Amino acid sequence: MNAPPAFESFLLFEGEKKITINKDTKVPNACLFTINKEDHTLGNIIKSQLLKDPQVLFAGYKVPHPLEHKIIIRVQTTPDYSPQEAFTNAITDLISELSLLEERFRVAIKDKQEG
């Protein structure tokens, strides 16, 4: 009777923020990015892209509870490199790589048809 619907996994609720930044107090230059209504699709690629950057000292996400739709990403970089710009660069260059992959796949398909 109380099974949740299907739209509460991706659709935002009124008042609920898509992303929230929270600075950590245990170590300097460390913030936990909390993402709402998402899953491993949008966190694993960002985790790996952050891992590629050498200036990022720490990078990793988790799922507080599988039924609940939220992921926390913790990022810790060098003191001369804020984690906000690290996250922004990771997202931007991941977008660029995905677009390039799209373009290459499309040209490969169009060449494969009768060619």
Partner 1 sequence: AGILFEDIFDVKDIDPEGKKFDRVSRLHCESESFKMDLILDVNIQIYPVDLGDKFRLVIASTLYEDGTLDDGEYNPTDDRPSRADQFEYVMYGKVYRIEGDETSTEAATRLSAYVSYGGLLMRLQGDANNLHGFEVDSRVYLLMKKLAF
Partner 2 sequence: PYANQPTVRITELTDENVKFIIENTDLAVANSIRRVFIAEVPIIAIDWVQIDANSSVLHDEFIAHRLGLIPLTSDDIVDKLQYSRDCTCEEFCPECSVEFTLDVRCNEDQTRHVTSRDLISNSPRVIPVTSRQDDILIVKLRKGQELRLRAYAKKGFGKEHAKWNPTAGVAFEYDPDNALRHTVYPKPEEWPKSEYSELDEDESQAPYDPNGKPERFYYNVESCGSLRPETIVLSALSGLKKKLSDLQTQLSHEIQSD
Residues 25-44 that bind partner 2 (CB under 8 A): 33, 35, 40-42, 44
Position 108 contacts partner 2 (CB under 8 A): yes
Q: Which C-beta is closer to partner 1: that of 78 or that of 82?
A: 78
For partner 2, the binding residue among 20, 28, 60, 62 (CB under 8 A) is 20
Position 102 contacts partner 2 (CB under 8 A): yes
At 20, list the tokens.
């929230």
Positive or negative, the Cα torsion across 32, 36, 40, 42? negative
Tell me the DSSP string of 16-79: --SEEEEE-SSSSSEEEEEEES--THHHHHHHHHHHH-TTEEEEEEE-S-TTS-EEEEEEEE-T
Interacting residues toward partner 2 by CB under 8 A: 6-7, 9-11, 17-21, 33, 35, 40-42, 44-45, 47-49, 52-55, 84, 87-89, 91-102, 104-106, 108-109, 112-113
